[PDB]
Amino acid sequence: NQIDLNVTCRYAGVFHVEKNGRYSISRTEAADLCQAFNSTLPTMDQMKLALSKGFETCRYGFIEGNVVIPRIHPNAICAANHTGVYILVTSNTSHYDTYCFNASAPPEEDCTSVTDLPNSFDGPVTITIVNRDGTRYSKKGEYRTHQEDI
Ligand SMILES: O=C1Nc2ccccc2C[C@]12CCCN2
C-alpha cells in the first residue's frame, strides 16, 4: 500500500506534484493532496507569479478552475511550443498531475528538498515524497477524503 509523490522546487510557493509516475490524480484528489502539504490549488494569478520567478514544467496539472502547463522556454513537445501559463482546452480524460500553493514558502525560487507531509492524517498507506535530487521522506498515513479516489 504505497503512494509515491514526486515534488518540485517551489516558486513563490507554487510547486508541482506527480503521483506514482503517471497522470493519476482526479480534481477531488488534487485538493486533498495539496491540503496534506498545508497548501491549496493555485489560483491563475498565483501560477502566473510563479512562472515569472522561473517555474516551468512539461506536465498537465490542476490549478483552481483549469488544468495547465506553465512554460518559459518554447519546446515542441511541451504545450505545443507555447509559452506562458498554457491552458488545456480539449481532453477526453480527467486525471492529471497537480499544482499546489504554500503561502508560507519563500517568495522566489526555493529548490531545497521537501522533508515533511505536515497535514496528512492517520491511515495505512506508506506515502513517499521523492525530490528531484533523489532525497526521500516517507510516512504512514492517508490524505484522500473521497472514497471514489481510493
Ligand atoms: O523523473 C523524475 N522527476 C522528478 C521530478 C520531481 C521530483 C522527483 C522526480 C523523480 C525523477 C528524477 C529522477 C527519476 N525520477
Short mmCIF file of N, CA and C and ligand atoms in Angstrom, two decimals:
data_model
loop_
_atom_site.label_atom_id
_atom_site.label_comp_id
_atom_site.label_asym_id
_atom_site.label_seq_id
_atom_site.Cartn_x
_atom_site.Cartn_y
_atom_site.Cartn_z
N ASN A 1 0.87 -1.17 0.00
CA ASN A 1 0.00 0.00 0.00
C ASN A 1 0.91 1.22 0.00
N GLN A 2 1.31 1.66 -1.19
CA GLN A 2 2.31 2.70 -1.36
C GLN A 2 1.86 3.78 -2.35
N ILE A 3 2.20 5.03 -2.05
CA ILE A 3 1.97 6.17 -2.94
C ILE A 3 3.28 6.93 -3.02
N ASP A 4 3.78 7.19 -4.23
CA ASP A 4 4.99 7.99 -4.45
C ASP A 4 4.54 9.35 -4.93
N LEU A 5 5.07 10.42 -4.33
CA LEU A 5 4.75 11.79 -4.75
C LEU A 5 6.04 12.46 -5.17
N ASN A 6 6.20 12.74 -6.47
CA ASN A 6 7.38 13.48 -6.93
C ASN A 6 7.06 14.94 -6.81
N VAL A 7 7.91 15.70 -6.12
CA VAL A 7 7.67 17.13 -5.93
C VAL A 7 8.80 17.96 -6.49
N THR A 8 8.45 19.15 -6.95
CA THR A 8 9.45 20.07 -7.48
C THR A 8 9.88 21.13 -6.48
N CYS A 9 10.87 21.96 -6.89
CA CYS A 9 11.15 23.28 -6.29
C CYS A 9 9.82 24.04 -6.19
N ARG A 10 9.77 24.98 -5.27
CA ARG A 10 8.65 25.90 -5.12
C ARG A 10 9.07 27.24 -5.73
N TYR A 11 8.13 27.91 -6.36
CA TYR A 11 8.36 29.23 -6.96
C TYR A 11 7.27 30.11 -6.49
N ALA A 12 7.58 31.09 -5.61
CA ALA A 12 6.54 31.89 -4.98
C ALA A 12 5.44 31.00 -4.36
N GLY A 13 5.89 29.89 -3.76
CA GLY A 13 5.01 28.95 -3.06
C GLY A 13 4.38 27.89 -3.92
N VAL A 14 4.47 28.02 -5.25
CA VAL A 14 3.81 27.07 -6.15
C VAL A 14 4.73 25.93 -6.52
N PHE A 15 4.21 24.69 -6.49
CA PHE A 15 5.01 23.53 -6.85
C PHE A 15 4.15 22.51 -7.56
N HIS A 16 4.81 21.56 -8.22
CA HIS A 16 4.14 20.51 -8.98
C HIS A 16 4.30 19.18 -8.24
N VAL A 17 3.23 18.36 -8.25
CA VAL A 17 3.22 17.05 -7.62
C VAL A 17 2.73 16.04 -8.65
N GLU A 18 3.53 14.98 -8.90
CA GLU A 18 3.15 13.88 -9.78
C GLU A 18 3.00 12.64 -8.90
N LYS A 19 1.88 11.94 -9.01
CA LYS A 19 1.63 10.74 -8.20
C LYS A 19 1.93 9.47 -8.98
N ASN A 20 2.72 8.58 -8.39
CA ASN A 20 3.00 7.26 -8.96
C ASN A 20 3.51 7.27 -10.39
N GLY A 21 4.24 8.31 -10.76
CA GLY A 21 4.93 8.34 -12.04
C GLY A 21 4.07 8.41 -13.28
N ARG A 22 2.80 8.76 -13.11
CA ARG A 22 1.90 8.88 -14.26
C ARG A 22 0.75 9.81 -13.94
N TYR A 23 0.00 10.26 -14.96
CA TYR A 23 -1.17 11.14 -14.70
C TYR A 23 -2.20 10.29 -13.94
N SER A 24 -2.43 10.60 -12.68
CA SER A 24 -3.28 9.72 -11.86
C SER A 24 -4.08 10.42 -10.81
N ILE A 25 -4.16 11.75 -10.87
CA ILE A 25 -4.85 12.49 -9.82
C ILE A 25 -6.15 13.11 -10.36
N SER A 26 -7.27 12.87 -9.68
CA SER A 26 -8.53 13.50 -10.02
C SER A 26 -8.59 14.92 -9.43
N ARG A 27 -9.58 15.74 -9.82
CA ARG A 27 -9.70 17.08 -9.24
C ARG A 27 -9.94 17.03 -7.72
N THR A 28 -10.77 16.07 -7.25
CA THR A 28 -11.02 15.96 -5.79
C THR A 28 -9.77 15.49 -5.07
N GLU A 29 -9.03 14.54 -5.66
CA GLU A 29 -7.80 14.07 -5.01
C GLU A 29 -6.75 15.18 -4.94
N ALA A 30 -6.70 16.03 -5.97
CA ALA A 30 -5.74 17.13 -6.03
C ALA A 30 -5.92 18.07 -4.87
N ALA A 31 -7.16 18.47 -4.57
CA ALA A 31 -7.39 19.38 -3.45
C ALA A 31 -6.96 18.75 -2.14
N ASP A 32 -7.27 17.46 -1.94
CA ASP A 32 -6.91 16.76 -0.71
C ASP A 32 -5.41 16.62 -0.58
N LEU A 33 -4.73 16.35 -1.69
CA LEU A 33 -3.29 16.21 -1.68
C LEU A 33 -2.62 17.53 -1.30
N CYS A 34 -3.04 18.66 -1.92
CA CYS A 34 -2.45 19.95 -1.53
C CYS A 34 -2.74 20.24 -0.06
N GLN A 35 -3.92 19.87 0.44
CA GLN A 35 -4.25 20.08 1.87
C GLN A 35 -3.27 19.34 2.78
N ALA A 36 -2.78 18.16 2.38
CA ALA A 36 -1.77 17.44 3.16
C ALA A 36 -0.43 18.18 3.25
N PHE A 37 -0.15 19.07 2.28
CA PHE A 37 1.03 19.92 2.31
C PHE A 37 0.67 21.31 2.90
N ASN A 38 -0.47 21.45 3.65
CA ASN A 38 -0.91 22.78 4.15
C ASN A 38 -0.97 23.79 3.02
N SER A 39 -1.45 23.31 1.86
CA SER A 39 -1.45 24.07 0.62
C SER A 39 -2.83 24.02 -0.03
N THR A 40 -3.01 24.82 -1.08
CA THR A 40 -4.25 24.83 -1.83
C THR A 40 -3.94 24.74 -3.30
N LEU A 41 -4.97 24.50 -4.13
CA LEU A 41 -4.73 24.57 -5.59
C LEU A 41 -4.43 26.03 -5.93
N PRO A 42 -3.37 26.30 -6.70
CA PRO A 42 -3.06 27.70 -7.00
C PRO A 42 -4.16 28.39 -7.76
N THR A 43 -4.30 29.69 -7.55
CA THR A 43 -5.14 30.49 -8.43
C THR A 43 -4.32 30.74 -9.70
N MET A 44 -4.98 31.14 -10.78
CA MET A 44 -4.27 31.51 -12.01
C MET A 44 -3.24 32.63 -11.76
N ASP A 45 -3.60 33.65 -10.95
CA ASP A 45 -2.63 34.72 -10.71
C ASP A 45 -1.45 34.25 -9.86
N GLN A 46 -1.67 33.32 -8.91
CA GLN A 46 -0.52 32.77 -8.15
C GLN A 46 0.39 31.98 -9.09
N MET A 47 -0.19 31.22 -10.04
CA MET A 47 0.59 30.47 -11.01
C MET A 47 1.36 31.42 -11.94
N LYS A 48 0.71 32.52 -12.39
CA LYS A 48 1.45 33.46 -13.26
C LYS A 48 2.63 34.09 -12.52
N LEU A 49 2.49 34.38 -11.23
CA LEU A 49 3.62 34.94 -10.49
C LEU A 49 4.73 33.89 -10.36
N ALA A 50 4.36 32.63 -10.08
CA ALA A 50 5.38 31.56 -10.01
C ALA A 50 6.14 31.44 -11.33
N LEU A 51 5.41 31.49 -12.46
CA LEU A 51 6.01 31.43 -13.80
C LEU A 51 7.06 32.54 -13.95
N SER A 52 6.69 33.76 -13.51
CA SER A 52 7.60 34.89 -13.64
C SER A 52 8.87 34.74 -12.82
N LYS A 53 8.85 33.91 -11.76
CA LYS A 53 10.01 33.66 -10.91
C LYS A 53 10.85 32.47 -11.41
N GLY A 54 10.44 31.81 -12.50
CA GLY A 54 11.24 30.72 -13.04
C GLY A 54 10.57 29.36 -13.13
N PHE A 55 9.28 29.26 -12.80
CA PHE A 55 8.59 27.96 -12.81
C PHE A 55 8.13 27.52 -14.17
N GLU A 56 8.56 26.32 -14.57
CA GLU A 56 8.03 25.67 -15.75
C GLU A 56 8.06 24.17 -15.57
N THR A 57 7.09 23.50 -16.17
CA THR A 57 7.07 22.03 -16.18
C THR A 57 6.69 21.60 -17.60
N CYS A 58 6.68 20.28 -17.85
CA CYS A 58 6.18 19.74 -19.10
C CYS A 58 5.02 18.78 -18.80
N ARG A 59 4.22 19.08 -17.78
CA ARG A 59 3.14 18.18 -17.38
C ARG A 59 1.85 18.93 -17.09
N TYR A 60 0.72 18.38 -17.51
CA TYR A 60 -0.57 18.97 -17.17
C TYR A 60 -0.83 18.78 -15.67
N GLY A 61 -1.34 19.82 -15.03
CA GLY A 61 -1.78 19.69 -13.64
C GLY A 61 -2.88 20.66 -13.28
N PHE A 62 -3.69 20.28 -12.30
CA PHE A 62 -4.77 21.15 -11.85
C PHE A 62 -4.24 22.39 -11.16
N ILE A 63 -4.94 23.49 -11.43
CA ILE A 63 -4.97 24.70 -10.62
C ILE A 63 -6.46 24.91 -10.29
N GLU A 64 -6.81 25.97 -9.55
CA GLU A 64 -8.23 26.27 -9.30
C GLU A 64 -8.86 26.69 -10.64
N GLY A 65 -9.79 25.89 -11.11
CA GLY A 65 -10.55 26.24 -12.30
C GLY A 65 -10.08 25.69 -13.60
N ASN A 66 -8.80 25.32 -13.74
CA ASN A 66 -8.31 24.83 -15.03
C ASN A 66 -7.21 23.80 -14.85
N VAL A 67 -6.80 23.18 -15.96
CA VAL A 67 -5.65 22.27 -15.99
C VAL A 67 -4.63 22.96 -16.90
N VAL A 68 -3.37 23.12 -16.43
CA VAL A 68 -2.39 23.95 -17.12
C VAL A 68 -1.02 23.36 -17.16
N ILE A 69 -0.16 23.97 -17.99
CA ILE A 69 1.27 23.73 -18.01
C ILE A 69 1.96 25.09 -18.00
N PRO A 70 2.73 25.46 -16.96
CA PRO A 70 3.49 26.72 -17.03
C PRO A 70 4.73 26.50 -17.91
N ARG A 71 4.91 27.40 -18.90
CA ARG A 71 6.05 27.31 -19.82
C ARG A 71 6.83 28.59 -19.91
N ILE A 72 8.15 28.50 -19.82
CA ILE A 72 9.02 29.65 -20.05
C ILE A 72 9.66 29.52 -21.43
N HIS A 73 10.32 28.37 -21.70
CA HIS A 73 11.03 28.17 -22.96
C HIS A 73 10.21 27.38 -23.93
N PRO A 74 10.08 27.84 -25.19
CA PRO A 74 9.30 27.06 -26.15
C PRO A 74 9.93 25.70 -26.41
N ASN A 75 9.13 24.66 -26.29
CA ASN A 75 9.59 23.30 -26.55
C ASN A 75 8.45 22.63 -27.30
N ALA A 76 8.75 22.05 -28.48
CA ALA A 76 7.71 21.49 -29.34
C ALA A 76 6.89 20.35 -28.71
N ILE A 77 7.45 19.63 -27.75
CA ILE A 77 6.71 18.54 -27.11
C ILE A 77 6.12 18.93 -25.73
N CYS A 78 6.20 20.23 -25.35
CA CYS A 78 5.63 20.70 -24.10
C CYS A 78 4.65 21.80 -24.44
N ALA A 79 3.35 21.53 -24.27
CA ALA A 79 2.30 22.51 -24.54
C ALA A 79 2.38 23.08 -25.96
N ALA A 80 2.66 22.21 -26.94
CA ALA A 80 2.70 22.61 -28.35
C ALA A 80 3.53 23.88 -28.64
N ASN A 81 4.70 23.99 -27.99
CA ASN A 81 5.64 25.08 -28.20
C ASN A 81 5.21 26.43 -27.61
N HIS A 82 4.14 26.44 -26.81
CA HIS A 82 3.67 27.70 -26.25
C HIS A 82 4.49 28.14 -25.05
N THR A 83 4.41 29.44 -24.74
CA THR A 83 4.99 30.00 -23.51
C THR A 83 3.84 30.61 -22.68
N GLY A 84 4.13 30.92 -21.42
CA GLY A 84 3.13 31.43 -20.51
C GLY A 84 2.42 30.28 -19.83
N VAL A 85 1.35 30.59 -19.09
CA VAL A 85 0.55 29.53 -18.49
C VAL A 85 -0.34 28.96 -19.60
N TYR A 86 -0.03 27.78 -20.10
CA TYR A 86 -0.80 27.15 -21.18
C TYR A 86 -2.01 26.47 -20.57
N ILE A 87 -3.20 26.80 -21.06
CA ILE A 87 -4.43 26.21 -20.56
C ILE A 87 -4.91 25.08 -21.44
N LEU A 88 -5.12 23.89 -20.86
CA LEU A 88 -5.67 22.75 -21.61
C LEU A 88 -7.12 23.10 -21.97
N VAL A 89 -7.47 22.98 -23.26
CA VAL A 89 -8.84 23.32 -23.69
C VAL A 89 -9.64 22.06 -23.91
N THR A 90 -9.10 21.07 -24.65
CA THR A 90 -9.89 19.90 -25.02
C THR A 90 -9.20 18.63 -24.62
N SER A 91 -9.88 17.81 -23.84
CA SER A 91 -9.36 16.50 -23.45
C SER A 91 -10.52 15.59 -23.18
N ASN A 92 -10.37 14.30 -23.53
CA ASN A 92 -11.43 13.35 -23.17
C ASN A 92 -11.38 12.98 -21.68
N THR A 93 -10.20 13.08 -21.04
CA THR A 93 -9.89 12.43 -19.79
C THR A 93 -9.77 13.37 -18.60
N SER A 94 -9.78 12.79 -17.39
CA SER A 94 -9.99 13.54 -16.17
C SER A 94 -8.86 13.50 -15.16
N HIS A 95 -7.80 12.72 -15.42
CA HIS A 95 -6.73 12.55 -14.43
C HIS A 95 -5.43 13.16 -14.88
N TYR A 96 -4.87 14.02 -14.02
CA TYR A 96 -3.65 14.74 -14.39
C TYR A 96 -2.71 14.72 -13.20
N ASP A 97 -1.65 15.55 -13.22
CA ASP A 97 -0.87 15.78 -12.00
C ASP A 97 -1.57 16.94 -11.27
N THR A 98 -0.95 17.52 -10.23
CA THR A 98 -1.50 18.73 -9.63
C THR A 98 -0.43 19.74 -9.35
N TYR A 99 -0.85 20.99 -9.26
CA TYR A 99 -0.02 22.04 -8.69
C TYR A 99 -0.60 22.34 -7.30
N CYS A 100 0.26 22.84 -6.40
CA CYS A 100 -0.13 23.22 -5.05
C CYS A 100 0.52 24.56 -4.73
N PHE A 101 -0.06 25.30 -3.79
CA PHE A 101 0.44 26.60 -3.39
C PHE A 101 0.54 26.65 -1.87
N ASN A 102 1.75 26.89 -1.35
CA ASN A 102 2.00 27.01 0.09
C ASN A 102 2.36 28.48 0.36
N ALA A 103 1.46 29.21 1.01
CA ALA A 103 1.69 30.62 1.30
C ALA A 103 2.87 30.89 2.21
N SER A 104 3.35 29.89 2.97
CA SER A 104 4.47 30.08 3.90
C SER A 104 5.85 29.80 3.28
N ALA A 105 5.89 29.38 2.02
CA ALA A 105 7.14 29.10 1.32
C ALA A 105 7.83 30.41 0.99
N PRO A 106 9.09 30.36 0.55
CA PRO A 106 9.80 31.61 0.23
C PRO A 106 9.19 32.34 -0.98
N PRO A 107 9.45 33.65 -1.11
CA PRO A 107 8.79 34.42 -2.18
C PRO A 107 9.27 34.12 -3.58
N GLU A 108 10.50 33.61 -3.74
CA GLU A 108 11.02 33.42 -5.08
C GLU A 108 11.33 31.92 -5.30
N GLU A 109 12.46 31.54 -5.90
CA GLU A 109 12.75 30.12 -6.14
C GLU A 109 13.26 29.48 -4.89
N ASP A 110 12.69 28.36 -4.54
CA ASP A 110 13.14 27.55 -3.42
C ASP A 110 13.35 26.12 -3.91
N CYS A 111 14.63 25.80 -4.18
CA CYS A 111 15.00 24.48 -4.64
C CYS A 111 15.62 23.65 -3.56
N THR A 112 15.26 23.89 -2.29
CA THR A 112 15.60 22.96 -1.24
C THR A 112 14.65 21.76 -1.34
N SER A 113 15.02 20.65 -0.70
CA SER A 113 14.20 19.45 -0.74
C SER A 113 13.09 19.51 0.29
N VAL A 114 12.01 18.77 0.00
CA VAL A 114 10.84 18.67 0.85
C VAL A 114 11.04 17.45 1.72
N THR A 115 10.93 17.66 3.04
CA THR A 115 11.24 16.66 4.04
C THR A 115 10.07 16.41 5.02
N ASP A 116 8.82 16.76 4.64
CA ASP A 116 7.66 16.63 5.52
C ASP A 116 6.36 16.63 4.70
N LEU A 117 5.32 15.97 5.21
CA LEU A 117 3.96 15.99 4.67
C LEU A 117 3.16 16.35 5.92
N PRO A 118 3.09 17.64 6.27
CA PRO A 118 2.67 18.01 7.63
C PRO A 118 1.24 17.79 8.02
N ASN A 119 0.35 17.74 7.05
CA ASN A 119 -1.08 17.67 7.34
C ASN A 119 -1.76 16.43 6.80
N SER A 120 -1.01 15.34 6.62
CA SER A 120 -1.66 14.07 6.29
C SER A 120 -2.34 13.57 7.58
N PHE A 121 -3.29 12.66 7.42
CA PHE A 121 -3.99 12.13 8.59
C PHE A 121 -3.65 10.66 8.80
N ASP A 122 -4.15 10.08 9.89
CA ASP A 122 -3.90 8.68 10.20
C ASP A 122 -4.41 7.78 9.06
N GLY A 123 -3.64 6.76 8.74
CA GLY A 123 -4.05 5.83 7.70
C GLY A 123 -3.01 4.79 7.43
N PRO A 124 -3.31 3.86 6.51
CA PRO A 124 -2.43 2.70 6.32
C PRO A 124 -1.42 2.77 5.19
N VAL A 125 -1.43 3.86 4.42
CA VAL A 125 -0.59 3.96 3.22
C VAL A 125 0.83 4.45 3.52
N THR A 126 1.86 3.84 2.90
CA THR A 126 3.20 4.38 3.02
C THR A 126 3.30 5.45 1.92
N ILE A 127 3.38 6.70 2.32
CA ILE A 127 3.46 7.80 1.37
C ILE A 127 4.91 8.26 1.32
N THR A 128 5.50 8.27 0.13
CA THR A 128 6.88 8.68 -0.02
C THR A 128 6.98 9.92 -0.90
N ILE A 129 7.58 10.98 -0.36
CA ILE A 129 7.89 12.20 -1.08
C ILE A 129 9.26 11.97 -1.72
N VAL A 130 9.33 12.16 -3.04
CA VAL A 130 10.55 12.00 -3.79
C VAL A 130 10.95 13.33 -4.37
N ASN A 131 12.13 13.83 -4.00
CA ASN A 131 12.66 15.07 -4.55
C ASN A 131 13.46 14.78 -5.81
N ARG A 132 13.67 15.79 -6.66
CA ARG A 132 14.39 15.56 -7.91
C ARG A 132 15.82 15.10 -7.68
N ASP A 133 16.44 15.55 -6.57
CA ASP A 133 17.80 15.10 -6.24
C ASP A 133 17.84 13.71 -5.61
N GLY A 134 16.71 13.03 -5.53
CA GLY A 134 16.64 11.64 -5.07
C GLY A 134 16.36 11.50 -3.58
N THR A 135 16.47 12.60 -2.81
CA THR A 135 16.20 12.50 -1.38
C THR A 135 14.74 12.17 -1.16
N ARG A 136 14.48 11.28 -0.20
CA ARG A 136 13.13 10.81 0.04
C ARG A 136 12.72 10.97 1.47
N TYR A 137 11.43 11.15 1.68
CA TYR A 137 10.82 11.21 3.03
C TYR A 137 9.59 10.33 2.99
N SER A 138 9.41 9.45 3.96
CA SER A 138 8.26 8.56 3.97
C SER A 138 7.53 8.64 5.28
N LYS A 139 6.22 8.45 5.22
CA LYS A 139 5.41 8.40 6.44
C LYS A 139 4.17 7.59 6.15
N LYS A 140 3.64 6.95 7.20
CA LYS A 140 2.44 6.15 7.06
C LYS A 140 1.25 7.08 7.32
N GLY A 141 0.28 7.06 6.43
CA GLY A 141 -0.89 7.89 6.61
C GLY A 141 -1.90 7.78 5.49
N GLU A 142 -2.65 8.86 5.31
CA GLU A 142 -3.64 8.96 4.24
C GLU A 142 -3.91 10.45 4.04
N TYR A 143 -4.32 10.84 2.84
CA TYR A 143 -4.73 12.21 2.57
C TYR A 143 -6.05 12.27 1.78
N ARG A 144 -6.52 11.14 1.21
CA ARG A 144 -7.72 11.14 0.36
C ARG A 144 -8.97 11.08 1.20
N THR A 145 -9.88 12.02 1.00
CA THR A 145 -11.13 12.07 1.75
C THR A 145 -12.33 11.58 0.94
N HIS A 146 -12.18 11.35 -0.37
CA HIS A 146 -13.29 10.90 -1.20
C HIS A 146 -13.10 9.41 -1.52
N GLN A 147 -14.06 8.53 -1.15
CA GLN A 147 -13.93 7.09 -1.40
C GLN A 147 -13.66 6.71 -2.85
N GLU A 148 -14.27 7.43 -3.81
CA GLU A 148 -14.08 7.16 -5.23
C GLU A 148 -12.64 7.39 -5.71
N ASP A 149 -11.82 8.10 -4.93
CA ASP A 149 -10.40 8.26 -5.27
C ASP A 149 -9.54 7.12 -4.65
N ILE A 150 -10.07 6.34 -3.70
CA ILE A 150 -9.28 5.29 -3.05
C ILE A 150 -9.40 3.93 -3.73
O1 LIG B 1 11.73 11.88 -13.30
C1 LIG B 1 11.81 12.37 -12.23
N1 LIG B 1 11.09 13.59 -11.99
C2 LIG B 1 11.06 14.16 -10.66
C3 LIG B 1 10.60 15.50 -10.51
C4 LIG B 1 10.49 15.96 -9.21
C5 LIG B 1 10.78 15.10 -8.14
C6 LIG B 1 11.20 13.80 -8.29
C7 LIG B 1 11.31 13.31 -9.60
C8 LIG B 1 11.72 11.83 -9.82
C9 LIG B 1 12.64 11.81 -11.08
C10 LIG B 1 14.10 12.32 -11.37
C11 LIG B 1 14.90 11.13 -11.34
C12 LIG B 1 13.84 9.96 -11.81
N2 LIG B 1 12.61 10.27 -11.40
#
